[PDB]
Amino acid sequence: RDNMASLIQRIARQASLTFREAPMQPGFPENLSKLKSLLTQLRAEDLNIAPRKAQPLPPNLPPVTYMHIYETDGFSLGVFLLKSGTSIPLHDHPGMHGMLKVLYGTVRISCMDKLDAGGGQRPRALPPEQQFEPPLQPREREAVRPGVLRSRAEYTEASGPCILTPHRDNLHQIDAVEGPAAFLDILAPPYDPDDGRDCHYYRVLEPSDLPREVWLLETPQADDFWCEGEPYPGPKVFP
Numbered sequence: 001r002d003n004m005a006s007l008i009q010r011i012a013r014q015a016s017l018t019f020r021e022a023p024m025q026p027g028f029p030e031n032l033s034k035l036k037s038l039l040t041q042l043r044a045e046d047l048n049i050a051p052r053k054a055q056p057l058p059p060n061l062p063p064v065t066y067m068h069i070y071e072t073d074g075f076s077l078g079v080f081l082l083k084s085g086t087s088i089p090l091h092d093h094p095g096m097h098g099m100l101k102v103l104y105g106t107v108r109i110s111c112m113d114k115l116d117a118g119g120g121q122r123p124r125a126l127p128p129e130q131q132f133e134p135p136l137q138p139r140e141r142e143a144v145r146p147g148v149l150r151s152r153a154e155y156t157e158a159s160g161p162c163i164l165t166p167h168r169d170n171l172h173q174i175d176a177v178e179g180p181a182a183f184l185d186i187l188a189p190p191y192d193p194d195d196g197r198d199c200h201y202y203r204v205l206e207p208s209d210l211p212r213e214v215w216l217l218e219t220p221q222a223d224d225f226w227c228e229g230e231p232y233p234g235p236k237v238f239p
């Protein structure tokens with residue numbers, strides 16, 4: 001088609017429309033579906049990103065880097081690039097929608113949820129006789145949350161986009177499998193560490209098929225996990 005904008009420009013436009021009389025313009029389900037359709041076509045070369053290949057990783061070096069593309073009050077759009085053998089630890093997206101698409105490599109994405117009484121669940125407190133390895137401080141015991149591990153699959157550039165919602169698959173961990181990997185990430189609304197919309201990390205507690213119930217404990221961002229910026233080489237998103 002003539003006069004078509006770059007795919008990344010069109011993705012950014014559609015995320016803007018999705019998240020933010022006559023004839024009626026689309027609603028959220030239609031828009032979300034279109035956004036996912038655009039993302040299924042996205043390839044690494046469309047962002048002028050070459051697949052990387054490849055340690056040990058010294059503390060001096062970030063395991064993951066970040067390639068910023070665009071953001072509004074409604075959404076953020078960027079690329080995360082994982083080095084070999086690294087992972088983005090388990091974390092949530094409070095009140096956020098998200099969608100991601102692998103550009104190269106393979107990632108294992110573990111998807112979970114905290115049990116929510118608003119979804120008809122009845123979250124219980126840790127029973128007193130339940131013990132873990134490592135053992136929990138008594139203060140920790142009362143901060144434990146019940147959750148469910150829903151899925152734990154591997155995704156590549158050929159997989160469909162991975163979607164999460166405020167209430168479904170809202171917690172995830174992303175491990176680079178067998179070498180470096182990278183993915184485009186859309187989040188709506190963006191994180192706001194200043195306005196109380198933080199990225200919270202969690203660990204799964206150790207007391208056989210999925211879905212299965214788990215116990216989750218919020219934890220600080222890991223000492224050795226950090227993610228610094230690097231130049232984005234793809235087509236610019238205007239303005």
Ligand SMILES: [Co+2]
Pocket residue numbers: 091092093172
């Ligand atoms: Co995430």
